[PDB]
């Protein structure tokens, strides 16, 4: 897989959705990216695993915790991602 850093320009709505978190026992993953939106402009993609949100490790975050941190992020929103390249 490939490590990437994305700065998403603000303000929110950022134009994406996430799934997973510690309370779901799964990594935080981008599920939907709005066809027209900030996340799409920044080349955030469905399936991208969020490794960090504004420098903060995402692994131990609850789902609602990751959501809130994204929703309330300063501009730009900084995401560190792990992009799976395998089919
Ligand atoms: Cl891979
Ligand atoms: Cl990087």
List the helices and strands and how they pair.
Elements: E1 2-8, E2 16-21, E3 26-33, H1 38-41, E4 49-53, E5 56-57, H2 63-71, E6 77-83
Antiparallel strand pairs: 1-6, 2-3, 4-5, 4-6
Bound molecules: chloride ion (2 copies).
One chloride ion binds next to loops.
Describe the protein's architecture and organization.
This protein has a 4-stranded antiparallel beta sheet with strand order 1-6-4-5. It has a two-stranded antiparallel sheet with strand order 2-3. The protein has a single domain, classed as Roll (Pdz3 Domain). The protein is mostly beta strands and 87 residues long. 15% of the residues lie in helices and 40% in strands. The chain is built from 2 helices and 6 strands; from the N terminus they run E-E-E-H-E-E-H-E. The protein is globular, with a radius of gyration of 12 Å. The termini are close together. Strand 2 and strand 3 form a beta hairpin. The chain binds chloride ion (2 copies). The site of one chloride ion (CL) has 3 residues, from strand 1.
């Amino acid at each position: 897989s490939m490590a990437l850093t994305v700065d998403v320009a603000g303000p929110a709505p950022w134009g994406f959705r996430i799934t997973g978190g510690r309370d779901f026992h799964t990594p935080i993953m981008v599920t939907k990216v709005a066809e027209r939106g900030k996340a799409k402009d920044a080349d955030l993609r469905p399936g991208d695993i969020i490794v960090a949100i504004n420098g903060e490790s995402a692994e131990g975050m609850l789902h609602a915790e990751a959501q809130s941190k994204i929703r309330q992020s300063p501009s730009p929103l900084r995401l560190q991602l792990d992009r799976i390249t395998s089919l």
